[PDB]
Write an enzyme that holds these catalytic residues in place. Structure first.
Site, PDB file in Angstrom:
ATOM      1  N   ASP A 215      -4.992 -45.772 -14.301  1.00 25.84           N
ATOM      2  CA  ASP A 215      -4.412 -46.762 -13.394  1.00 25.84           C
ATOM      3  C   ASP A 215      -5.450 -47.355 -12.448  1.00 25.84           C
ATOM      4  O   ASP A 215      -5.234 -47.426 -11.240  1.00 25.84           O
ATOM      5  CB  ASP A 215      -3.258 -46.148 -12.592  1.00 25.84           C
ATOM      6  CG  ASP A 215      -1.921 -46.276 -13.302  1.00 25.84           C
ATOM      7  OD1 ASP A 215      -1.690 -47.322 -13.943  1.00 25.84           O
ATOM      8  OD2 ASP A 215      -1.106 -45.335 -13.216  1.00 25.84           O
ATOM      9  N   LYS A 217      -7.038 -50.096 -10.609  1.00 26.36           N
ATOM     10  CA  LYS A 217      -6.837 -51.465 -10.146  1.00 26.36           C
ATOM     11  C   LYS A 217      -7.357 -51.652  -8.723  1.00 26.36           C
ATOM     12  O   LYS A 217      -7.769 -50.690  -8.072  1.00 26.36           O
ATOM     13  CB  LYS A 217      -5.360 -51.855 -10.230  1.00 26.36           C
ATOM     14  CG  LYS A 217      -4.373 -50.754  -9.873  1.00 26.36           C
ATOM     15  CD  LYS A 217      -2.988 -51.098 -10.405  1.00 26.36           C
ATOM     16  CE  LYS A 217      -1.969 -50.012 -10.093  1.00 26.36           C
ATOM     17  NZ  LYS A 217      -1.591 -49.992  -8.648  1.00 26.36           N
ATOM     18  N   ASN A 220      -6.083 -49.646  -5.757  1.00 30.63           N
ATOM     19  CA  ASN A 220      -6.445 -48.230  -5.704  1.00 30.63           C
ATOM     20  C   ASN A 220      -7.898 -47.994  -5.303  1.00 30.63           C
ATOM     21  O   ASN A 220      -8.423 -46.892  -5.467  1.00 30.63           O
ATOM     22  CB  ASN A 220      -6.175 -47.559  -7.052  1.00 30.63           C
ATOM     23  CG  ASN A 220      -4.700 -47.299  -7.290  1.00 30.63           C
ATOM     24  OD1 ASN A 220      -3.896 -47.330  -6.361  1.00 30.63           O
ATOM     25  ND2 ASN A 220      -4.340 -47.025  -8.539  1.00 30.63           N
TER      26      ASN A 220
HETATM   27  C1  LIG Z   1       7.711 -41.522 -12.405  1.00 32.53           C
HETATM   28  C2  LIG Z   1       6.474 -42.347 -12.799  1.00 32.53           C
HETATM   29  C3  LIG Z   1       5.635 -41.767 -13.931  1.00 32.53           C
HETATM   30  O1  LIG Z   1       6.003 -40.755 -14.528  1.00 32.53           O
HETATM   31  N1  LIG Z   1       4.494 -42.441 -14.169  1.00 32.53           N
HETATM   32  C4  LIG Z   1       3.682 -41.999 -15.127  1.00 32.53           C
HETATM   33  C5  LIG Z   1       4.154 -41.764 -16.408  1.00 32.53           C
HETATM   34  C6  LIG Z   1       3.255 -41.301 -17.347  1.00 32.53           C
HETATM   35  C7  LIG Z   1       1.977 -41.100 -17.027  1.00 32.53           C
HETATM   36  N2  LIG Z   1       0.971 -40.666 -17.779  1.00 32.53           N
HETATM   37  C8  LIG Z   1      -0.103 -40.635 -17.008  1.00 32.53           C
HETATM   38  O2  LIG Z   1      -1.225 -40.284 -17.371  1.00 32.53           O
HETATM   39  N3  LIG Z   1       0.201 -41.038 -15.784  1.00 32.53           N
HETATM   40  C9  LIG Z   1      -0.952 -41.043 -14.820  1.00 32.53           C
HETATM   41  C10 LIG Z   1      -1.138 -39.733 -14.077  1.00 32.53           C
HETATM   42  C11 LIG Z   1      -2.522 -39.778 -13.443  1.00 32.53           C
HETATM   43  N4  LIG Z   1      -2.672 -40.911 -12.507  1.00 32.53           N
HETATM   44  C12 LIG Z   1      -4.071 -41.095 -12.053  1.00 32.53           C
HETATM   45  C13 LIG Z   1      -4.853 -39.951 -11.855  1.00 32.53           C
HETATM   46  C14 LIG Z   1      -5.755 -39.533 -12.834  1.00 32.53           C
HETATM   47  C15 LIG Z   1      -6.549 -38.404 -12.634  1.00 32.53           C
HETATM   48  C16 LIG Z   1      -6.471 -37.701 -11.436  1.00 32.53           C
HETATM   49  C17 LIG Z   1      -7.276 -36.574 -11.249  1.00 32.53           C
HETATM   50  N5  LIG Z   1      -7.089 -35.534 -12.081  1.00 32.53           N
HETATM   51  C18 LIG Z   1      -7.807 -34.405 -11.982  1.00 32.53           C
HETATM   52  C19 LIG Z   1      -7.585 -33.346 -12.853  1.00 32.53           C
HETATM   53  C20 LIG Z   1      -8.339 -32.181 -12.741  1.00 32.53           C
HETATM   54  N6  LIG Z   1      -9.271 -32.060 -11.812  1.00 32.53           N
HETATM   55  C21 LIG Z   1      -9.524 -33.101 -10.916  1.00 32.53           C
HETATM   56  O3  LIG Z   1     -10.396 -32.973 -10.057  1.00 32.53           O
HETATM   57  C22 LIG Z   1      -8.783 -34.273 -11.006  1.00 32.53           C
HETATM   58  C23 LIG Z   1      -9.007 -35.323 -10.131  1.00 32.53           C
HETATM   59  C24 LIG Z   1      -8.259 -36.490 -10.249  1.00 32.53           C
HETATM   60  C25 LIG Z   1      -8.546 -37.500  -9.329  1.00 32.53           C
HETATM   61  C26 LIG Z   1      -8.855 -38.797  -9.724  1.00 32.53           C
HETATM   62  C27 LIG Z   1      -9.143 -39.765  -8.769  1.00 32.53           C
HETATM   63  C28 LIG Z   1      -9.143 -39.439  -7.418  1.00 32.53           C
HETATM   64  C29 LIG Z   1      -8.847 -38.141  -7.022  1.00 32.53           C
HETATM   65  C30 LIG Z   1      -8.557 -37.174  -7.977  1.00 32.53           C
HETATM   66  C31 LIG Z   1      -5.582 -38.128 -10.453  1.00 32.53           C
HETATM   67  C32 LIG Z   1      -4.787 -39.250 -10.658  1.00 32.53           C
HETATM   68  C33 LIG Z   1      -2.302 -42.193 -13.145  1.00 32.53           C
HETATM   69  C34 LIG Z   1      -0.931 -42.165 -13.805  1.00 32.53           C
HETATM   70  C35 LIG Z   1       1.510 -41.330 -15.789  1.00 32.53           C
HETATM   71  C36 LIG Z   1       2.337 -41.777 -14.843  1.00 32.53           C
END
Ligand SMILES: *CCC(=O)Nc1ccc2[nH]c(=O)n(C3CCN(Cc4ccc(-c5nc6cc[nH]c(=O)c6cc5-c5ccccc5)cc4)CC3)c2c1
Length: 366
Positions: A215, A217, A220
């Site tokens: 996501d 954009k 963000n």
């Molecule tokens: C109700 C709405 C809904 O369900 N929406 C939805 C549906 C299906 C989805 N599939 C998806 O993949 N998403 C995304 C979930 C993740 N989000 C952005 C995002 C990505 C990565 C991280 C993150 N993850 C980790 C994991 C392990 N260790 C880490 O250190 C991490 C760090 C991060 C991270 C990334 C950036 C900044 C800080 C931390 C977090 C968020 C997008 C949608 C769905 C959503």
């Protein structure tokens, strides 16, 4: 030495499109759950530590896979015709996750304001009383269930009787979207700076965390006091403009999704306008898939070639879609002359200093 626990056809509700579409799903012993347009591993597809719901609304015999990924709850809903097949899938999935699993108070944070609200929780701006610092707090319903320079770091995580809290860093140099709106366009150098720090961050998530941000954009992207980039993590379980063509058809998205997103973001900065815009969402969908990319005819060829490679329709033909991933973009002419180890070490001098007295300055909250 990885086996498939169960395999079969299922009706999957599009995660970004509200209509039902048939996909071929595979459940492997590791806990992977991937659907395909036709019968032929990022942690996004993991079924590790997920909830299983059995609903009859709207369509009967529908089951939902509620997953907590990092600090964001996701839902994956599926439909099957016979009620018995729903039982065969749920018992399979649960046994997998079960077998896979085996192998500070809130008083320090003053409620400043509400930033967002979702199905399973809220996001509030808070102040740590002992330090006077500014953080964002994800509070999520408990019933639901290491650090990078340019990611909003998760600082604290604690529980209450009914909710689960995540205290995350909150940048005070304003949102990048607004910054772009004041200048209405960014110099190639400035966009190169911003893009670089993102490339480093996307590389981190991909290469080390084994995950897709999915996501990326303008809304963000934020800035810290110095002017460096902070990618936000404030999403709740509640925009067709930033969507990738591969995500549109709901087939086999991968790391390339982040690279498409990067292209769109970098386009807006150097061009001043969204690459594919239309009020009609349906025409914007045909715009993304069918139409060819256009340019203001005033850009350096390096940038033009970078955006062209990043906004190609086929994810494997798209720049950074290959096995090398991020490095394909790091070796680009537009990113030539940039030492990337220095990028990660914040050695890059920010082209823009946000108008901020200190870490605790509260100017950009208006
Ligand atoms: C109700 C709405 C809904 O369900 N929406 C939805 C549906 C299906 C989805 N599939 C998806 O993949 N998403 C995304 C979930 C993740 N989000 C952005 C995002 C990505 C990565 C991280 C993150 N993850 C980790 C994991 C392990 N260790 C880490 O250190 C991490 C760090 C991060 C991270 C990334 C950036 C900044 C800080 C931390 C977090 C968020 C997008 C949608 C769905 C959503």
């Amino acid at each position: 030495d990885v086996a498939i626990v169960k395999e079969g056809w299922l009706h999957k509700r599009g995660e970004y499109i509200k209509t039902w579409r048939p996909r071929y799903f595979l459940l492997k012993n590791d806990g992977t759950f991937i659907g395909y347009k036709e019968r032929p591993p990022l942690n996004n597809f993991s079924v590790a530590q997920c909830q299983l719901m059995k609903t009859e609304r709207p369509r009967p015999n529908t089951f939902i896979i509620r997953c907590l990924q990092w600090t964001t709850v996701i839902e994956r809903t599926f439909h099957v015709e016979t009620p018995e097949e729903r039982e065969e899938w749920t018992t399979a999935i649960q046994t997998v996750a079960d077998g896979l699993k085996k192998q500070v108070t809130m008083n320090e944070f003053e409620y400043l304001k509400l930033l967002g609200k979702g199905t399973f929780g809220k996001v509030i701006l808070v102040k740590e009383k002992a330090t006077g610092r500014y953080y964002a707090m994800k509070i999520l319903k408990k019933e639901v269930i290491s650090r990078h320079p340019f990611l909003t770091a998760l600082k604290y995580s604690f529980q209450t009787h009914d909710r689960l809290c995540f205290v995350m860093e909150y940048a005070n140099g304003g949102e990048l979207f607004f910054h772009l709106s004041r200048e209405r366009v960014f110099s190639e150098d400035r966009a190169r700076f911003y893009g670089a720090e993102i490339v480093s961050a996307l590389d981190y998530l991909h290469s080390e965390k084994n995950v897709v941000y999915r996501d990326l954009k303008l809304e963000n992207l934020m800035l810290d006091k110095d002017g460096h980039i902070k990618i936000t993590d404030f999403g709740l379980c509640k925009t067709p403009e930033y969507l990738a063509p591969e995500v549109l058809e709901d087939n086999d998205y991968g790391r390339a999704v982040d690279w498409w997103g990067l292209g769109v973001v970098m386009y807006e900065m150097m061009c001043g306008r969204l690459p594919f815009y239309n009020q009609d969402h349906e025409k914007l969908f045909e715009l993304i898939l069918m139409e060819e990319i256009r340019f203001p005819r005033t850009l350096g060829p390096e940038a033009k070639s970078l955006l062209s490679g990043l906004l190609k329709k086929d994810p494997k033909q798209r720049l950074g879609g290959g096995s090398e991933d991020a490095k394909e973009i790091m070796q680009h002419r537009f990113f030539a002359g940039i030492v990337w180890q220095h990028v990660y070490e914040k050695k890059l001098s920010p082209p823009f200093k946000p108008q901020v007295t200190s870490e605790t300055d509260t100017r950009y909250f208006d």
